[model samples]
Target chain A: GMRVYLGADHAGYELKQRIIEHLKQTGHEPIDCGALRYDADDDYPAFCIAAATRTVADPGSLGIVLGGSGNGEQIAANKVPGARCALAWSVQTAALAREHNNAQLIGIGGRMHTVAEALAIVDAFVTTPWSKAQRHQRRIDILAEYERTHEAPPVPG
Target chain B: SGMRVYLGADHAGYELKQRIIEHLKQTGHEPIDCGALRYDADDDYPAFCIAAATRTVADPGSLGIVLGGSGNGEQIAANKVPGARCALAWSVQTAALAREHNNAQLIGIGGRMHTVAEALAIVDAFVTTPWSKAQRHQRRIDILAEYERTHEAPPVP
Candidate 1:
């Protein structure tokens, strides 16, 4: 059972609660990052950044963020140094986030999908493992190098 | 109203890429093929995706499409570029939200995961949608841009 951090704004409050309970029942430890009290005007960046920060600190843990459309949440999560976040729209997308990108976090939309679909997406994300293939590793390393140095990675030459 | 659209794909998506280019033409969009001009079994996605991404970033209003076996690697490749916000769109909802919420400049699709019709719908949704320009969305994206430049995580408060 892996440890997972969860964060959400008002737009995702209900789904976030459902996911928290679901994660508990499935044996994974879920750490809530916030919007602890739903405010209709709550912002997502704080919560998402909190979750992403925790994931980065814990190395082996993963994180998830949610918002009305999920796009903003993903952008916020990716702002964390060392955090690779992907927005997942389907099971394949969720699986690929880990399998190919080695993303440590996934962003989901509460208003765009049903509870069942979101649950399934979460399952796919949690179950998939990073492929760590040489090709994939090379790509990830290039991004990491770019992140650290603010230098663009070289194109095929 | 015709936009110059750039496209890139590895051999895994050659057939689908060809079909989409024709579809773009039929729909009155100018499609630019960045390469993998001919399918080679060993062709890589980074070369093609980087070219497309660079083109999209250089042309502010223009967007790009990248395709691959699962679309995950293609998205990661495109996103390595400083200003490219590449989103994997597996559904119409995700496609529209990518533009509306993240102002994503590139869409990544899986050639093997969806039918030609489905992929076409995804593309249509992406191009037709406009960014919402919501303050929160703008702030979130700004945070990402800051991180891209500074390689430092924004303080989560």
Candidate 2:
């Protein structure tokens, strides 16, 4: 029922490969949507968009997109509707993403996180569950409505 | 990269969620659409909140938006997610503070509250504004998270 999100260009090729291997050894499914090899000419958005769109449609599935700085790839993934792409620079951030923000995709800079460090962040994200239930939901609804019609309710009597 | 957004709502917000999804798509961002996806008027707000928080916490650097007819129930539901930092976005100032002081991961809007354009403007501000690093704002954020951690309802001595 769990799936991995993976995308990369020449910039992220090595990191993506390492992540894929890590997933495999852990008995997890890592879906590599693009950049099988690496090409300096390859674009990050191409892979970022593809992986993000796929993850968005799949609901529970998670994704990880990579680029040189990792910033552009993050921007691209967040573009998809219903996609909440978060960039995790540390394991704590990754855990917070899953625990507080309920993020599904992780954006990483192959240039930023080492193979070991990236895997740790990925693990933190995968293992954590949203713990706060009461205080958070009320506000989330308001936002959902805003996104739909772009409005808010009137003052209560 | 700066502002965090959240979404959730009731049956009245159903279509709105779809619309918001489109808007997020057009704007190049993923939005969390709280449920009643099928328009089940009797749907419970808690279910929507679960979906919203589930998604929000899974990834960091992302926000949530929730909704409802009056936007009341949606807000209540979103608060259920621990550490969700859900907030009600009604006035321009409230929207601004939600990001600045609260670092809110979710924002609730009442579909029946204002004109469609008004709601969109509020969301735009919520998304575009950067969280103020003013000492006052940061202090407030810390206090809120503290309350979340302690789970102690307000009863100042």
Candidate 3:
């Protein structure tokens, strides 16, 4: 069973609540890294970054960060080292995040989805596996290089 | 495409990058080519992506595009540049909003995921949509940039 770490902003609290049960029903361990209480003015970086950091510390774990705008959630998650986060608005992109990039964290625009739609996206993400294509792995390693060296990944010939 | 659009990509998108430049020029935009100058199958995306984002911010009002297999790492790489807000776009709606709500300086496209025609349309949407300039949207973006700069959590609203 996968351990799915979740983080959400004030606006998405209800959706987050539903998603936790959804994960449980699907045989996954759902961890809340959250905005334990909903504050109208609460910022996303705190919770989203925490979830991403935790996802990195526990390899093979997945993270989901939801918010009204979503971009900030994704950007904040990326701020954590070893965290590869992608913004997923549709099932195709949800599946693509892991298949191609092996992204451990997904940032979703809660304002754009209904409960059913959001759960479908979560299903797509959890069901998909990284392609493991040599070419794809090469690209992933390039991102790793930037994290380690703070230098741009090489343009290998 | 009426103003400037900068582009960068590795071999996965090297050929598509040229086609995009052609499309931009045909649509009356000044297109800047930011390298993977030659096709090397092993070329990495970060340097090229960072270059495109660097040029876009330097030009103030210009926009940039970065391409990769899933466009995930490219989006992450482009946003590493200060003042760059890069959105990975899989659909026209997402592309348009990169500017409409986020005032993103760059858009990341997945070269292998979509056909040349589909990808072109997505780019078209991004180039044509103007930023929303709405108060709510601006406040969100300002907060995002603040977090990027400080790497500190913002106080609860």
Q: Is candidate 1 or candidate 2 better by TM-score?
A: 1
What is the Cα root-mean-square deviation between model 1 and the actual structure? 2.7
Candidate 3 lDDT (Cα, 0 to 1): 0.81
Q: Give candidate 3's iRMS in Å, 1 decimal.
A: 3.2
Task: Return the candidate ranking by lDDT, descending.
Answer: 1, 3, 2
Give the fraction of true interface contacts kept by model 1. Answer: 0.23
DockQ per candidate, 2 decimals: 0.34, 0.03, 0.36
Isolated chain A: TM-score per model? Answer: 0.97, 0.87, 0.95
Interface RMSD of the predictions, in order shown? 3.3, 18.0, 3.2
Question: In lDDT terms, how accurate is model 1?
Answer: 0.82
List, residue by residue over B1-157, the lDDT tens digit for candidate 3: 3889889998888888899999999998888888878888877787898778877988998999998877877887777676778887877877887788678878888888899999999989989999889886677667767766776655533
Which stretches of model 3 miss by more than 4 angstroms?
A10-13, A35-43, A111-114, A130-134, A153-157, B38-41, B155-157
In candidate 2, what are the lDDT values of residues A36-95, reduced to their tens digit? 876665555557667877887786788888765454455455444455555565676567
lDDT of 2: 0.62
Clashing pairs in 3: A41-B157
Off by over 4 Å in 1: A148-157, B134-136, B155-157
Reference-based TM-score of each model: 0.86, 0.48, 0.84
